[PDB]
Structure formats: C-alpha cells, structure tokens
Design a protein around this ligand. Sequence first.
Ligand SMILES: *[C@@H]1O[C@H](CO)[C@@H](O[C@@H]2O[C@H](CO)[C@@H](O[C@@H]3O[C@H](CO)[C@@H](O)[C@H](O)[C@@H]3O)[C@H](O)[C@H]2NC(C)=O)[C@H](O)[C@H]1NC(C)=O
Ligand SMILES: CC(C)CCC[C@@H](C)[C@H]1CC[C@H]2[C@@H]3CC=C4C[C@@H](OC(=O)CCC(=O)O)CC[C@]4(C)[C@H]3CC[C@]12C
Ligand SMILES: CC(C)CCC[C@@H](C)[C@H]1CC[C@H]2[C@@H]3CC=C4C[C@@H](OC(=O)CCC(=O)O)CC[C@]4(C)[C@H]3CC[C@]12C
Ligand SMILES: CC(C)CCC[C@@H](C)[C@H]1CC[C@H]2[C@@H]3CC=C4C[C@@H](OC(=O)CCC(=O)O)CC[C@]4(C)[C@H]3CC[C@]12C
Ligand SMILES: CC(C)CCC[C@@H](C)[C@H]1CC[C@H]2[C@@H]3CC=C4C[C@@H](OC(=O)CCC(=O)O)CC[C@]4(C)[C@H]3CC[C@]12C
Ligand SMILES: *[C@@H]1O[C@H](CO)[C@@H](O)[C@H](O)[C@H]1NC(C)=O
Ligand SMILES: *[C@@H]1O[C@H](CO)[C@@H](O)[C@H](O)[C@H]1NC(C)=O
Ligand code: BEF
Ligand SMILES: [Mg+2]
Lengths: 327, 1112
Amino acid sequence: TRRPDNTAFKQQRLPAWQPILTAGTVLPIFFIIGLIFIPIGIGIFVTSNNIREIEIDYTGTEPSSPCNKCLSPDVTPCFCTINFTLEKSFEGNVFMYYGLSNFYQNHRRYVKSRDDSQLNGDSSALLNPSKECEPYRRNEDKPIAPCGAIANSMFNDTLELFLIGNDSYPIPIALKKKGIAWWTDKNVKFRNPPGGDNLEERFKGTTKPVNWLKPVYMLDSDPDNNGFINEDFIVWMRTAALPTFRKLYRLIERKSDLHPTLPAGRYSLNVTYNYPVHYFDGRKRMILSTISWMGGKNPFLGIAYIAVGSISFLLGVVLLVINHKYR
Amino acid sequence: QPNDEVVPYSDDTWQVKANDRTFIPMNLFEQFKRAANLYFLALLILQAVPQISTLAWYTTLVPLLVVLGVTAIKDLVDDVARHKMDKEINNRTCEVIKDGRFKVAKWKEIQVGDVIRLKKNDFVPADILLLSSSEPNSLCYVETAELDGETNLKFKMSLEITDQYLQREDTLATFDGFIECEEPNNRLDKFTGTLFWRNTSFPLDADKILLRGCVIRNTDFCHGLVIFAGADTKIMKNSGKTRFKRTKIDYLMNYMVYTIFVVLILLSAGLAIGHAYWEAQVGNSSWYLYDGEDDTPSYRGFLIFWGYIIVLNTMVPISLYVSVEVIRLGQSHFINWDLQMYYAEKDTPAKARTTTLNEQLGQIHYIFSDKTGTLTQNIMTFKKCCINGQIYGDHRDASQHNHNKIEQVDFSWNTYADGKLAFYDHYLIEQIQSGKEPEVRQFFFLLAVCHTVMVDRTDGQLNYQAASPDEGALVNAARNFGFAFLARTQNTITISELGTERTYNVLAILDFNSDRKRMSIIVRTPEGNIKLYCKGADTVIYERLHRMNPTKQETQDALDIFANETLRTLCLCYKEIEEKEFTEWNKKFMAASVASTNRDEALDKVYEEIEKDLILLGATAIEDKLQDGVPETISKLAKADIKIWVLTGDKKETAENIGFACELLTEDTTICYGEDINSLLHARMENQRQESFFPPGGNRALIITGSWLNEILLEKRMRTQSKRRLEAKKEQRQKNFVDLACECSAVICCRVTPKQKAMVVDLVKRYKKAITLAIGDGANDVNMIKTAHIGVGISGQEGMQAVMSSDYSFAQFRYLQRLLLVHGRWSYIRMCKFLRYFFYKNFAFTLVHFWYSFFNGYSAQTAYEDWFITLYNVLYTSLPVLLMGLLDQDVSDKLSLRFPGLYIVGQRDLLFNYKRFFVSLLHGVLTSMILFFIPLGAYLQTVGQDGEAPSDYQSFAVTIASALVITVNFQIGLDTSYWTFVNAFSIFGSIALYFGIMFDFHSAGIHVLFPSAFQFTGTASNALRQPYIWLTIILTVAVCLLPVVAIRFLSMTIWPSESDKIQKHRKRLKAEEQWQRRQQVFRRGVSTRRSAYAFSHQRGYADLISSGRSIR
Ligand SMILES: *[C@@H]1O[C@H](CO)[C@@H](O[C@@H]2O[C@H](CO)[C@@H](O[C@@H]3O[C@H](CO)[C@@H](O)[C@H](O)[C@@H]3O)[C@H](O)[C@H]2NC(C)=O)[C@H](O)[C@H]1NC(C)=O
Ligand SMILES: CC(C)CCC[C@@H](C)[C@H]1CC[C@H]2[C@@H]3CC=C4C[C@@H](OC(=O)CCC(=O)O)CC[C@]4(C)[C@H]3CC[C@]12C
Ligand SMILES: CC(C)CCC[C@@H](C)[C@H]1CC[C@H]2[C@@H]3CC=C4C[C@@H](OC(=O)CCC(=O)O)CC[C@]4(C)[C@H]3CC[C@]12C
Ligand SMILES: CC(C)CCC[C@@H](C)[C@H]1CC[C@H]2[C@@H]3CC=C4C[C@@H](OC(=O)CCC(=O)O)CC[C@]4(C)[C@H]3CC[C@]12C
Ligand SMILES: CC(C)CCC[C@@H](C)[C@H]1CC[C@H]2[C@@H]3CC=C4C[C@@H](OC(=O)CCC(=O)O)CC[C@]4(C)[C@H]3CC[C@]12C
Ligand SMILES: *[C@@H]1O[C@H](CO)[C@@H](O)[C@H](O)[C@H]1NC(C)=O
Ligand SMILES: *[C@@H]1O[C@H](CO)[C@@H](O)[C@H](O)[C@H]1NC(C)=O
Ligand code: BEF
Ligand SMILES: [Mg+2]
C-alpha cells in the first residue's frame, strides 16, 4: 500500500478535445457538402452525356432478325451480319467490348472452379491439377491444362467490322488484339509452364479442355501472346461481379490523319456465331464506345451526386429552421 | 414480549484434548460456460467438411486463437493478483505451545486442543477457553466492536481451578485436560460444555470463552486453550455462502446473443429456400454451372443452408467478451490508481479486488451501511455542559462574549491536564478558579466520583482504563478541569480536588443496567457527611426530583438545546443522607446483598428505595465523532436518488443519536418504532382479511430493533397444506414490510444479527428488484457484503475481516462520493457506448453477403476478400472502440459531483435497453444496404472502362471493403466526446493499417511464394487509382454518415439530455455553496420533544469493584 503515481493517464486527466455539436458546427458541413457535390454531379453528368456509344444486340433470340438461323446451327460455322449506322463520327481511341447478360459468373460453384497454381506456370501443378476443378480435371486419362469451369466456358465468337463506303465495297477496319488486359495479370499472374522454347513440347501429357475446339497451342501464332498469357483468355478468366458484364475485346486506334477514327456512315458486323447462350435467357451484345478523360459513361454517379447535394442543402436549411425555432 | 436490549441469536459431542494436536481448466471453463466458443468450434467443424464449406479454415481460427490467448493472459494476471492480495494480507502470528515452550506460529498452524498465549490488543485467533491471565482472578477484558457494533468492553473470567494452577508456562506445557462441548454453531451468546481435569468435572459457560473477533484490552497477557478453529469458529459460521456475482448487463448480452442466433438461423433458412428455387428454375438451364453431381434443387438448398450459416457466422461477435473484459480490467485499474480515493493518514489506497462488477456501480438503488466503524471513528468527546441553568462550552473569551474567533484555553494551571481535551471557553475556567459558585466544582466532583473506571499508574502517567466510552470521556473532562480520579481501592477513592488530595470512603455503588438507566454512588466525606451522587437518563431522573428545584426549567432548556445539536445527554443529581436513614438502608441493602437466589430483584428494590429526593446539578453533552464528510456524502447520494439504510448491531439509543447526527433524521421526520410498524401491518392484514400506508406528503423514519424485526416478519397430508399456507402468509407479510419500509425517508435497524442484515438485504433485492450495495467493516457485516450485488469493506483498520469478501475496499465512507458518481457512472456510460457501437459495426459488416445473395444465385459467395474477413474484427475495428471505452467522459468529475442528478440516467436503464439493441441492428442493416447498393449502381455502368478497367469481382470487393472501413472508423469518431490524442491516433491509424496490410497482401512476392492462398494479387494497385472508384467511396461514406449527424443534432436540439445542458452552460457555472449543517431549529411550545439520552455500559463492574475481584 503506497501513494499511486500522479500521471495524466492514471488520474483520468489526459489532454483532450470536447466537440459539442453546436448549431454553428454542423450546418457548415452540410452546406459545404452540398456546394461541393452539386458541381461534381453536374460535371460528371455533362461528361457522360458527351460520349458516343453504340450497343448492338445480336443474340438473335427474337425472330425477324438476321441471326436467328444460328439458334439451331446444323452446320458448326454459322455466320450472321448486322447492319447499323453511326450518325456522328467518333474520335480518338475506340473500344470494342463483348457483353453477356444473365450470365452468373459470380456463382460460388463457378468462381472456385480454378487452379491459380497451374496458371502460374508450375511444373508440379501442370500435371495432377488441383482438386477444386474436379468436373473438368481430367478428360479421359490425362490432365486438362486449363482445368475448371471458368476456362471451358470461354467466349467462342469472332466479330469483325466493315465500313460501307461510297464505292459500295466493304472496307475492313483493323482491330488490335493486344494490350486489353491488366499488366500485372499478363506479366505476373499468368505465365507459361517453365522449360523449353517450343510451346508444343511444353504441354507434354496434357490435353485440351473438353469444350475448346483447339488446344492451348493454337490460341495465337505469336509466341508472346499464346499459352496462359493469351489476352483473350486473361480477360475472360477475370470473373465479373454481377450477372451483366462487359469484357474488353478489341482496340481501334485513332488514325494519325485528321479524319475521324470511325467516320460517320453505315457499318456491317460480321459475327461467327459459336457461343450458345439462348438456353438460359442470356443475351450477347457488342458495344462500341469512345474514350473519356474522366473514366467513362456513368450517369448514375452524376445523378446521385446531384440528388445528394440537393438533399444536403435542404437538410441544412431545415436544421437551421429547427434550431431557430427551438433556440 | 420483544426485548430491545438483546440481539436474537436464537431466532436464526465435540471433544478436545490439551497438548494432543493451469491453462487447460481455464480453457475448458471458458469453452463450456461461454456458448460462443462452442459455437465457433462447431463452425470450425462445419468448415472442415468440403461438401458444405464456404470459407477457409483460417477465418475462424486466426481470430479464435487470439481470443483464447488474450483471455488466458487476463486470467493468469488475475490469478497472480489474487494470490498476491491473499499472501500479503494474511500476515498474522500468535504464540502457541507446540514444543517445550512458546513458539511463534501463523494463525494457520492452530489445532483444536493446543494452548496459546495472547497479549494486549491482540486479535483472538480462534475460540479460546480462558485459562489464566495476569489480572487478579484471571479476569480479561475484551472489545467486541466487530462481532457486534458495541463499543464497550466486556469481561471474561476463568474457572477457579484453572486460575490457581495454570499461572505459569511450565504447567501449561504439561497441561492435559479433556473437554466435551457442543458441536460448532452460529450462536455467539451461549456455550454449554464440560471440562474434565484432575479427575473432576467442571461446567463451562459463555463467560469463559473468547470468540475470534474479540480484541484483548487492559490485560498484559492471557493464556487459553483453543476450542474451535478455522471455519468452525462461531463468527465464521455466520458468514453466508459465497456466490458468483453477475452484472445486470450480462444477462441482457446473453439474450442479445440468443436473438442474433435466431436471426441468423432465419436468414440462412430463407436464403436456402431461395437457392433451392433458383437452382430449380435457372440452375439446370445454365450449361456452364455443371459440376457433375446428381443433386436435386432441394438437396442443394439443404446443403447450402450450412454454407450460409458459415458465411453469416460473423454476425455473432467473436471478440465481444475479450473487449468487455479488457474494458472492465482497465476501469478497475483506474479505480485502483485514483488519488482522491487515497487515505494518507493510514496510507490505504482504494482497491478493486473484483474486476468484473464495474458498470453495476452506476445502477445502485439502495445502500446498506454499518454504523460502528463505518459512519463513526469510535471517538467521543465532552463538548458542552449546563450548570445551574447556564450553558457552558460555547465560544467565549474572559468573562464576557467578545468574538467567535477565540483561541484555546490553556490548562497550564492544572497539573494532571494534557492536550487530549480541546475546549474553547474561558468563562468556565474563571468560574472554576474563583470558586464563587461551589456547585461548579461539585459538578466535576460528581463527574469524577460517580464513574466506575479503573486507574493504572505503572509509569506514573495516571492512565484511565474505562469500560464505557462515555465514562472515559467524562472522567477525562473532570481530570482536565482539576478534579483527577487518582486511585481506588475496595472501600476508598482518592480524588484530588484542585491540588488537594482527599481520600473519601465509598459506602455503596448503585450499579447500571439497561432498565435502571442510571448509576449512583453513596460515599462518606472525610468530615463525616454522607452523600449520594447519581447520573443517568433525564427521563428516569426527572421523576425523582425533590419538590424544590428552581433550575429545573433552565436545565430542561439546556437538554433540549443539546438534543437539538445531536449530542448524548445525561442528567446529574445529588442528595444528603442522615445517619439513621443511612444505617436502616444499609441494613436492608446488606440483607438484599446476600440473598443470591433472587439477588437482582432485591437489589433493584433497595436501589429504588433510596433514590427518591434528588437535587439537580446540570447536564453533560458527549459528541460521538463521525468520519469526515459523512453527512455531505449522505446528502449528495440523496440528491442522486439513492436510499441509505443503516443496519447496525448497536443499541437503539446510539443508533438513533447517529441517525440524527448524520442528518438522516430531522425535526420534521416522525419516528416509528417496532410496535407502531407491527400495529400498522396488523391493521393492513386485517383489512385484507396499493393504498399508501402513510399520506404521501408526510415525512417519516423507521427505528426497528432486531427482536421487533423478527416479530413483524413472523420469523420468531395436512402438514403440506399447513406449510404452504404458512409460507404464503410469511411471503405476504414480508412484501408488506418491504413496501412500508421503501415508502419512508430513512430506515435504521438496531440489535440485528448478521443473518438479519443478510435477510433485510435479500428481502429488498427480491421484493423490490433493486440493485443493492453493502458497506461495512468487522465480521458481522461480512454476510451482507456477500449477499448484496456490490460489497464494500472499510479497510485501513486492523480488522481485515470485511475486506476479505468485499468487492471494493477503500478506507473511508466519504470516498463513496467518487465510487458511484464518477467511476460507476462513467463505467456505465462507456459500457453502453461500447455495446451499441460494437453491435452496429458487426451487423453492418455481415449483411453485405445477404444483400449480394440476390445477384449471385443465392450461392453463398462472399463479397469480401478471404483475408479481410479474417482481420476485420481483430485489426481494423478493434482498438478504437476499446480506447473509447477506456477514455470517454461526458462531463468532468468536478462537474459530475456537483450535479448528482446525472446518476439517474443509469438508474433507470436508459442508455442501453432491449430497444436500443434493435435500433443499432436497424442502423447496421441500413448501413450495409447503402454500402452495397451504391457501389452496385456505380458498377452496373462503366467504371473506368479501358485497358486497365477495374469492373470485376475483386475491384467490387475492395471498393466495398474500403467504404465499410472508412464508414465504421468515422462512426466511432462521431460517437466519442473525449478526443484524446490516442483516440484520434487509433481512429486514423486503423484505416492506415488496413490499407497497408491490403497493399501487402496484393503484392507480387507473396503471390510468387504461394499463389493458392492469395487470389487478389494486384487488385488494390489497379483499382484505387481510378477517380470513379474514389468518388463512389466518398459518396457511400457521405450517405452513410450525413443522416446520423442530422439525427444526432435534431435529438440534441429538441430533446437535450442533462449532460448536454450541463455542457452548453459549463462556462457560466460558478455558484457552488458547500454543504452546511442546518444551524438553528430552535422552537417553542413543548417542554420536551425528544429525549437525547444515550449511554453505553454493561452491568456487573460495580459488583467486581465492591468485591476484591477487580482489585490487584
Ligand atoms: C466453344 O466452341 C465450341 C465449338 O466451336 C462449342 O462448345 C463445345 O464444342 C464441343 C465440340 O468441340 C462440344 O462437344 C461435346 O462433346 C461431347 C463428347 O465429348 C458430346 O457428347 C456433346 O454432344 C458435344 O459434342 C460441346 O458440347 C460444346 N459445348 C456446348 C454445346 O455447350 C461452343 O461454340 C463454345 N462453347 C464453349 C463452352 O466454349
Ligand atoms: C444524404 C442522405 C440524407 C440522403 C441519401 C439518399 C440517397 C442515397 C438517395 C436519394 C435520391 C436517390 C437517387 C434517386 C434517383 C436516382 C436515379 C437512378 O437512375 C435511374 O434509374 C434513371 C435513369 C438514369 O440513370 O439515367 C439511379 C438511382 C438514383 C441515383 C438514386 C440514388 C440514391 C439517392 C441519391
Ligand atoms: C424471417 C424474415 C426476417 C425474412 C428473412 C429471410 C428472407 C430474406 C427470405 C425468406 C423467404 C425468402 C424468399 C423465398 C423464395 C424466393 C424465390 C426465389 O426464386 C425466384 O423467384 C428467382 C428465380 C428466378 O429468377 O427465375 C427468389 C428469392 C425468394 C423471393 C426468397 C428471398 C429471400 C427470402 C425473402
Ligand atoms: C430505408 C427506407 C428509406 C428505404 C427502404 C427500401 C428498401 C426496402 C429497398 C431499397 C433497395 C431494395 C432492394 C433493391 C434490389 C433488390 C434485388 C431484388 O432482386 C432482383 O432484382 C433480381 C436479382 C437477380 O438479378 O437475380 C430483390 C429485392 C431487393 C433486395 C430490394 C429489397 C428492398 C430494398 C432493400
Ligand atoms: C437516407 C438513407 C439512410 C435512406 C436509404 C437510402 C436508400 C433508399 C438508397 C441507398 C442506395 C440506393 C440504391 C442505389 C442503387 C440503385 C441501383 C439502381 O439501378 C440502376 O442504376 C440501373 C437501373 C437499370 O438500368 O435498370 C436502382 C436504384 C437503387 C436500387 C437505389 C435505391 C435507393 C437506395 C437503396
Ligand atoms: C446489310 O445490307 C446489305 C446491302 O446489300 C445486304 O446485302 C445485307 O443482307 C444486309 N444485312 C443485314 C440486314 O443483316
Ligand atoms: C463476312 O461476311 C461476308 C458476307 O458476305 C462473308 O465473307 C462471310 O459471311 C464473313 N466472313 C467469313 C470469313 O466467313
Ligand atoms: F458494525 Be455495525 F454497527 F454492526
Ligand atoms: Mg462496524
């Protein structure tokens, strides 16, 4: 038994601040929030309105469309063609996406059907894949190189664009198939199996996924864009978050000439229908969009910011009135 | 029938021969008792199964191991502290005969049947059969202020056989005697037995047995034989059974956890039917969701019921109990370190020896307090007097009053005087010195003659050994005023009057007993005159006054004033006896002094016969000192709506006097004794054979003796019917008494045994559903310290009986101001804030999975990273709430003692009901709703759609996690009202730690080491650099936080609480008038309105002195 130490902490006296929510301390934050949210909402809405985007739905589910014949494709190669128009020419880089609707890529039974060890370029995992991708682990007697339900359910559809010029002869449009995936994904997350120089001998003793028409070898002729580093494969493997999603497909680079990248006029879409989604009321779309210097076309954020700013201002006014009436 | 002078022990063979004598159980206890740990282990077992697992095995262990480690560490620290307290408070020793001669030995090395020796002021270790003592006839005086609240000294005597043969250790060592006595029991007044020695049998009696709580005084040494020991002692059998104490909030928390269990079960079942239907409709058509398992939709729903249970397990907290325990430990250590609760004189800091009963200090409804040693210092002094109708003792100088600021009279003129008596009155000194008024000296001569104290002059210092505090005080006052009682013998007294030593000749001593209420003495002066001097209660002396007494009215006024000042009053008288009358009365007295068959009644009648015509002298006032700041504490705790009851084992006069001196009772209060309460209860029972017993506007108090308490509570086959009807009647009577008692301003219980104190506390607890506190010292207060919700022991003294079983132990009654109005109130507020925020932030984190279920086929897919779920409850939202629960204050302590009315906030369960729980749950539900649905709306459209487009599952997860963390760590800041630097540091550092750890997990190196564990590689770097993501996060945080601010401001502005009002005007508060005693209540109309008589003494000492037993 002795005298306790006299210290700020022990004696329950530590230097501190006492923030009483005085009526002159809460109204300012309401008004500041309103005045800073309204202009941001206006700017975002204005930027979103000034973006030219065209979405073409080519699922062919409803009749009287020039792709319904591919809902019962007796012959494997089924070709459709969609005619559309661009009233106002685009400018700058243009992005081409393929989008799927009512496609649950966030299902738990589907998200886990993956082997990140095999996709990392591991000799031990290349054979004897992980047990998580059990339904598509081995085909008959050999491992499946991209095991899992994620790899098998991969977009099997080729899309091409043509411009109807004044000569009545379709003009092809070059589409870049590189630089459409995260740098880390292509350079760190995904890598080919180690050893050798020819991809043929690298995947020795491993078959193709049961659904893939051709093995991992012939995904691309370039030796820097085939294997597990294929960008059309990386883009798909990055599972979406909601039933409806858009995955980047191609980049159309702005021509060095002053002419628009996609001059206004008439265009034809050449789609090789191979991916079936009509069984479960899914839909397939092709989206052409232009680049923004603030993100992209997001009207929701602008409208929400406008509404929240207005509500904050109104709340500030009402709270001021109540404070005056009960002062 | 009921007696007001005896405690009712009744209404509540042993053979003795002389000299013929660490981690596994804590883990098991926490697992079994705490259902949460078993629940988490079951979740682990479920996660083991692969067919149902939806989360990795890391999730439930990584936090659970931390919980186990923290709990084990706290348990080890508590065990160490308890073992310390026990070791460093159990240091007591005594002399024992275990070898050829006496040896020192601790109280634990005592065996029934081993002789021992005790010294002055040495607590008795166990029940003893007194065998010998240094005093003549082997007498021994014992103070039992802790066995019962009696401040006078009792006397014990031993057998004549053991007195004349066991005077030396030589015979004690060879002592060999048999004893056969009753088995151990809880009856402290009687003891029946027999001692066989020297081939002869001798009966025993209570007057030969010293109990454990007794303290030996006025006796150099005392040799005895241990009869009982350990828990068999008569005072240890009066200790109730220790019980496990749980706060009122613990049961609320248990009901809360059960409700969360039910809610989780319902949500899991609903989502299970949802998934079953989805699989039936859309699951089979989806050709990409093929798993090769032939499971029907119903089987899938049943299987995923457990998956959703696992996913939503986090709804029930995993770190709730560790946080609560740390909070309570910190608050208890704050109580220990308190410097205002530190008694410098005895050097006794406060102590919180139980670290689990903290918030309950903020919910007290009743306090039950001992009187002797708790509300008093066991010190009383002679304050004022009245002589010939003149009141002496008030401040004065010289012979006429001049000013209040007067010095202290010097007693240099006296020879025996010392500094014990502090008297500020000069007129008395001049009156005595001059001698112009002989009755002034006669007054003090009476004070120095009528006593029955003893005098010891071993060192020539003239020490006074008094068996009654009142007699000691009066004799000291007389000695300081020149009349010193020097020596006594069988037939003489040798008082020295103003330096002249006159040896009188005592002729008779007329003894004191509770019924007689007075003492007297007949003595012959040296000249030859015979005079009788008496002193006693005013009531019994004003019926025997001679016809002629001019000073009667003036002395009556003086007595009224003394009673008004809360002092113990006695009246003094004398008379002259003629030779013939004296000889006749002496013949009759000697006739009545030999008849031992009915000696008491004959002596009483002889005493009555002589005290007929008495001449008054005046009155004396003795103040019984209270502990400093007792009335102030009582008034403050009364302003906080806390009712103080006094449960004392002391006589009725002392209890009433202290009640008046503590301001508990006043002139307005009407006092009801046992008989009035019994009559009221009988009338109410007859009426019933609700309405208030008294009019609401009145003021009343209760003074109930122990015997009357038993009488009014009825505590003084067809058999089953009789038992049930009797029990029902007893229950009705107890409820009626409780209702009547709780309707009155104050209640005082006197002459009550420890079992009765426990009975009253239990009755209040049961029939009023009130939180009770018990404060006291000694051994008789242990039972009510173990029965009440909170028990406090007054430490600092040599008696450490009540402190052993207490919960909190400080040294003075005053500190109760800070235990309740600062520590308890703050603890309650902090615990309520902690619980509210904790449930809010735990519910706001798990409902995101429920909301997401609608957009993933109800497939139990987590919306967070596999490792965020692990560390959320440990790293990101753990420190700030603990810090707010340890360092939060609404108003300063100096401003919380000044406004006791704040206490009621915790007294009615307002800060956390069972309704605030559902409000917090709704808040969490809305917060999760916003946190999920704003990012969802942002992600449906474009979100930075280019080559580096974070619009996938992982970007969604990191966005929601960031918004959640920011929102929660800003809500915690909104809650806090005491923004210490550490509070802000933790609030702003939890988020920084989250970001750092996230960027660490989303790193190339850790992925390279092992990629299976981490799948979110590179998501943070490529997802938090987009302006749209940050705008989404800011919008979510703003939407989550603005309505809370608006609602808080509106509630404060329209319905402000007491703390709000105090804080708003805190700057202008300067008026603080210290509590002052109500100076004057003098009135006219009644000659006497209360008899303030009070005397503490026991019959028998006059018998000892008249004979040679007490003379050495
Ligand atoms: C991918 O492209 C292919 C064709 O370009 C289509 O998917 C799958 O194509 C294979 C044939 O290459 C179909 O094989 C099936 O094999 C079993 C026996 O191995 C047989 O019993 C079946 O009747 C069928 O022949 C496979 O069914 C087919 N997947 C379907 C129809 O869902 C499709 O265009 C694209 N699909 C995917 C998932 O990438
Ligand atoms: C700040 C606190 C006190 C109020 C928080 C309420 C807001 C979260 C609510 C109020 C108005 C709501 C908005 C009302 C209207 C819309 C338009 C709606 O968009 C449409 O469907 C219309 C078509 C189009 O997007 O162009 C998207 C939801 C949104 C932004 C709502 C988002 C949520 C808002 C901002
Ligand atoms: C106990 C109280 C607190 C309710 C809490 C649980 C609810 C969230 C559960 C109970 C019943 C469940 C519903 C049971 C059945 C269905 C059918 C289910 O199947 C479909 O209609 C969608 C399939 C399709 O889109 O074709 C959709 C979810 C739903 C409404 C469930 C949604 C979640 C509900 C409302
Ligand atoms: C707090 C007050 C002011 C607003 C209370 C309104 C809520 C009850 C509303 C607001 C958002 C609504 C939710 C908006 C979206 C959905 C998804 C909806 O399911 C679908 O639309 C189909 C899912 C699929 O595509 O499979 C089920 C109802 C639910 C949960 C709604 C439940 C009712 C909610 C929570
Ligand atoms: C003041 C606060 C405490 C009250 C609660 C506010 C809610 C009513 C707000 C918060 C989030 C809002 C949701 C935010 C996002 C959406 C998605 C939005 O859908 C779309 O943007 C796409 C519409 C389409 O293309 O079909 C529909 C409104 C909704 C459900 C909003 C409904 C209103 C919500 C639930
Ligand atoms: C598009 O227009 C050309 C013009 O000749 C026509 O041949 C072709 O069939 C059209 N394709 C459609 C409508 O899908
Ligand atoms: C592109 O469309 C034209 C339309 O005539 C035709 O060559 C074919 O359908 C498509 N190309 C290929 C290679 O099939
Ligand atoms: F110490 Be109490 F007066 F029993
Ligand atoms: Mg006591």
